[PDB]
Symmetry: C3
Subunit: 344 residues, 3 copies
């Protein structure tokens, strides 16, 4: 050996010039003219050449085109393999020599760049857009470590559709839609509102701003109208005790948030004298919700005093309402009538 | 014929070895050295070769590179056609022999795979990402069966923009935006809220959860303040009938949801005796909304009883409010005054 | 010269036919059989040929395949350059001759079409889908005029993730997520609601529709329960003036929206006679919020009249509440007690 690291037909000439094997045909008018090299076996073959400037064989291309043609012959299923056993790239230059920008590049590590020789991802389009077309084209994302939990962004009937997809990529399930109108739907598919959500909407912080006056809300709801019950008595009121009196709410209101009650009292020639702050209230455990009505009996008087109030109380879990005299007025010539008149 | 299914220069040798035509140039230092085959017509030609390891002709590549070069000559508009007339693939291998993973594959049915020989879509990037770059690069989706109802996902000024697009792909109309801040806007373009929607937001089910206390709301709105009208009388109250009395609401409140009213009554030496549950109410068709005030005249008495209440009633479509004595108290030494004092 | 615009081995024949240089090997059974052209220098070389139908050299492909093979030799880092110095295209045809649809096209201006010879963008997939696969594959959009303000649509654990990204494409920050469940989150990452927004939600117009009854809301919030204070006196009421009396709200309610107050009055043998419309109100600048309670003293009477009311008033910025007699009733045998009983 020498340690110096450097055929049926062999053409060799050492020179500061291309050593060239040329095939040539200058016939400018023959429909079948051309020049080409062919490598073949007994079944098929591969051709490398250029057609004449009047060549009509569209199987190879247009007149004057160049071609690399792997023929059919009697062979089937054959590949054409383009192989760079090198750490360089495969460069495709079109409309320039190699001094131009490579239109496409396949690096030695598998990356593919369009309009860039240095791709950053497996496919990288430099300084340009991408488009896909069809009757329902979709950009799909297939996750390999999971099973049938894939995604896609597609178009259908002008609606941009974000849909899940299976590992076979053939059973989409629309989850989000945006129409040409600009309306978005999440679980809806014909979004009429600017944003329809077929489900609960949650503000984790901040709450909800409104458009008429930029109203900011982070609470709940209220009311405006109510169901009347007329003068539905809650029971007899004792006039002789200052202890707590309970009353059971009508079944109809046992499902309400608020109840409206009416308390009326009168006193003529009473058996006591003094100010009775009647307390009306509902209970949620320790908490109470409290209203008062004044009843001032004056013993012996030849007249009749009277008072009433109508007010709202929270409807609580125990379905009761309570009443308590601060001073027992007495039943003599006096009265106290307690009614539930509405609920909501 | 035989049924056995199997040139200006013809090189044939049947053998268990490559039959080879070789051109060769070992000049390692010439700036113009190389070896190549050329097929040409009278206008242009195509070269297949390798340059010398000191070749400086950058039109073909870097020193020592291999090349397929379709020349310009005097020909214009010509194609280079790479043709596999076979049901196999076109394989591009870079950095390996054919025993490696094909970097790119073009199947016989038109599918293109990067890093996979078995693509599932027309373009399929196996085990890698895709990126597009520019000053406003966009992934576009063109629908062919429709006319100018296309979509795209682009970037502009750090904002991810989902915009409709025409079949010419040159007139985007932003519909959704997400900023680097993380804010989303639907019909807005400078989203300040975490989610701005230039239009109605609809919860089809579930309603709306809140962040302070996880409040869940599926209703509407209420109030807190109101417009005062002072003591604006609603009209004279008859003291002599138990039939329904109507009164017309002031024009100012005819647009409100609720009205606040004040009813006062007094009775001295009256002409009747008994409990009068005065009923004050508003009407929506069959429905009524009802309050009561007690008035207990006592004939002959040398004193004056008095009562009043101030309360809210729904403002209804007929713009009226009504009053009804359960017992006519009489006008003698007595009075009933009815006022609308506010609305909201 | 003539103005007419039209080698170590030179093969030329002008004819209406291909002028052909052929190399051929019909050995159908040799594991090493093949036919090929080779261009080489002293380090490496490039081969163009076809393998025998029993050729086992997988480095070139499968038996009978055709190949363009840029060899390793003693050369490193070398490119294979495919160059069309023409305004035409580079066409890749697979499964057809050039009369078919080009599977891939590289135009002279750099555009790349799959299944189309006339691409509209730098990369254009005609009548087909695109898919990317991996353990977390992403479609990325890199903006060049800005610095580290890029976007991407990826998949991770079945969740479609819209995340910002840097110009190095290696530090994603999830901003929007959609789960296989169909739930969307903006700033959340495990969306439980159909739409979670970790921040304020803004309706620029239209407001908010609801699902139970299609309720439409564009306002704010209300209440239902409240904090009781019992009978907490607001101060002494003067009985001798019709001028405005102020009272300071308890510190506990100075942070509330509404306050609930209780006013009681009684009158026996008074020193005046007439109707006193006691006015109770809160102030926001010019605006007042007004309730009234009737007190009708009757001088000399041998009885005691009484009245009370309990009602809600807006809690205003000045933390005061006010009271005003329309006629001073007098302190003789009479009383007026004013309490704040609740707030919310
Ligand atoms: Cl009275
Ligand atoms: Cl009262
Ligand atoms: Na009274």
């Amino acid at each position: 050996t020498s340690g110096n690291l450097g055929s049926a037909l062999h053409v060799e000439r050492t020179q500061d010039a291309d050593t060239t094997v040329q095939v040539r045909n200058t016939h400018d008018t023959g429909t079948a003219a051309g020049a080409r090299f062919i490598a073949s076996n007994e079944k098929s073959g591969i051709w490398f050449g250029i057609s004449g400037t009047s060549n009509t064989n569209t199987g190879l291309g247009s007149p004057g085109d160049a071609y690399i043609y792997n023929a059919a012959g009697t062979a089937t299923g054959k590949n054409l393999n383009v192989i760079n056993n090198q750490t360089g790239n495969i460069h495709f230059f079109a409309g320039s020599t190699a001094t131009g920008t490579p239109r496409m590049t396949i690096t030695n590590t598998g990356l593919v760049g369009i309009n860039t020789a240095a791709p950053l991802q497996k496919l990288h389009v430099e300084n340009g857009n991408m488009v896909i077309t069809g009757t329902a084209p979709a950009y799909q994302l297939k996750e390999n470590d999971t099973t049938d939990q894939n995604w896609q962004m597609g178009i259908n009937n002008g609606n941009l559709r974000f849909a899940t997809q299976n590992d076979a990529l053939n059973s989409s399930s629309d989850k989000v839609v945006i129409s040409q109108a600009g309306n978005v739907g999440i679980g809806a598919t014909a979004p009429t509102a600017k944003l329809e959500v077929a489900g609960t909407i949650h503000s984790t912080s901040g709450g909800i701003k409104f458009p008429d006056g930029s109203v900011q809300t982070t609470a709940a709801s209220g009311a405006a109208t109510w169901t009347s019950l007329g003068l539905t008595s809650l029971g007899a009121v004792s006039m002789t005790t200052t202890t707590e009196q309970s009353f059971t709410l009508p079944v109809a209101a046992q499902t309400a948030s608020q109840i409206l009650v009416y308390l009326r009292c009168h006193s003529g020639n009473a058996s006591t004298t003094g100010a009775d702050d009647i307390r009306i209230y509902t209970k949620e455990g320790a908490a109470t919700y409290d209203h008062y009505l004044l009843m001032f009996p004056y013993a012996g008087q030849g007249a009749v005093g009277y008072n009433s109030d109508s007010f709202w109380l929270p409807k609580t879990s125990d379905n009761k309402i309570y009443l308590a005299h601060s001073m027992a007025p007495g039943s003599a010539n006096s009265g106290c009538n307690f009614y539930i008149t509405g609920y909501k």
